[PDB]
Write a protein that binds this ligand. Structure first.
Ligand SMILES: c1cc(-c2cnc[nH]2)ccn1
Ligand SMILES: c1cc(-c2cnc[nH]2)ccn1
Lengths: 239, 239
């Protein structure tokens, strides 16, 4: 099932990073994912194509100019037709996580508004934006990398495109050679015992989540098997 | 003060998104930031330039092939000289936040290793990586967008390149026109009263943090002024 994502950005060429390369580049080429960009600069009318403006109240920064940005959004909305969710990427938004990604991926159409400078007029958020989303508690130079991050994450859910599946960190992975700077591959992985290997990997995920991100465990209802392997991992750690 | 960032990636052209555009593009052009990429594909020797390999123990995915990736890392380390911190971008890493960004930005040299497929051999993390970092609890198709995100965030700290400064969400911002779809600019911002404007903005930040991200407040030692304005905001909310 196709996903269409409209993008509003002063730097649309940044999105070549996801539309021209890798898994996401394939998804675009195969028409599984469509990414369409509108640049507020194209909606300006003055000679110098001005896209920023001064904040009321003063301050050292600038904001996105309202008229070109508003017009770009309206154009994207018209192209989307009915049912597109309009998202503003900002640190004031809902924190993105895999559960949030799964939710966003349920939309067939999204419009992603990328801010630059000190951001956008609050009244545009009120009148034009459906949801604000943050990719993390850090400050960037613009909304483009967050938008690309969001697109990449939701793209993985599109059929044909391709251990947080159960909320745990991933297990360690090994490939050739069998010995690397004196470090050997765990023999269980060489055993060909599919069930032993499954349980080892799950136990490692549980142990790594417990040691690195114990808060993630509290959010889970562990299966009987997971409870057992976690107990074993914690016992081995204390021995 | 210059920052040098070495990048190991199968898709180095993705990094044009930050080296050719905007604030980060300027930083690169002005030699404030140098980004240098090595591609494991260039370190292969077989006819088909193979960069992936099968995981021991089976499973549906592939891993980065060790030899080309290892050789690329060693080459980057040699180019960096002494004192470069080597970072692997992964969901199993330390969660990036602004405090973490400030810490990373203290390094004059960084090497960022971007994984693809199901990631990299655990023994390479042991032997080659100094720190693992995550940009958030979501799964992407590769480490490139996280690396670019990290670069963008740390770049803001480089002198000459340019409200989490005190750990709060930002205040609303307004620009022209004075009225937008019936919504007016708060009169205080039109007053020209610099101290009233400062306090209004701070109060708004406190109110927005309290309503949207109350957990962020618990991590703060509020100033007397902040305690007062937060109390006022909470009173007005309950009235
Ligand atoms: C979403 C947006 C942003 C951001 C936009 N402009 C500066 N920072 C940061 C994180 N997640
Ligand atoms: C850092 C790396 C990753 C990632 C790398 N490969 C798949 N996901 C996700 C978030 N932060």
């Amino acid at each position: 099932s196709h996903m269409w994502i409209g993008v509003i950005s002063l730097f649309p060429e940044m999105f070549k990073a996801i539309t021209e390369f890798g898994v996401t580049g394939r998804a675009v080429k195969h028409n599984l994912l469509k990414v369409e960009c509108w640049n507020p600069r194209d909606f300006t009318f003055d000679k110098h194509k001005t896209v920023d403006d001064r904040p009321y109240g003063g301050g050292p920064g600038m904001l996105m100019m309202v008229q070109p940005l508003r017009d770009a959004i309206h154009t994207a909305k018209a192209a989307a037709g009915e049912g597109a969710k309009v998202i503003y990427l900002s640190p004031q938004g809902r924190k993105l996580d895999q559960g949030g990604v799964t939710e966003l991926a349920q939309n067939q159409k999204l419009i992603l508004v990328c801010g630059r400078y000190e951001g956008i007029d609050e009244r545009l958020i009120q009148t034009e934006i459906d949801e604000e989303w943050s990719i993390g508690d850090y400050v960037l130079t613009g909304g483009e990398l967050p938008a690309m991050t969001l697109i990449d994450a939701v793209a993985r859910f599109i059929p044909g495109v391709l251990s947080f599946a159960d909320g745990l960190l991933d297990c360690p992975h090994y490939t050739r050679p069998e010995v690397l700077e004196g470090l050997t591959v765990p023999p269980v992985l060489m055993s060909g015992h599919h069930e032993e290997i499954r349980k080892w990997r799950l136990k490692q995920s549980l142990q790594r989540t417990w040691l690195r991100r114990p808060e993630l465990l509290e959010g889970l209802a562990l299966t009987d098997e997971q409870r057992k392997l976690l107990k074993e991992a914690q016992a081995e750690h204390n021995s």
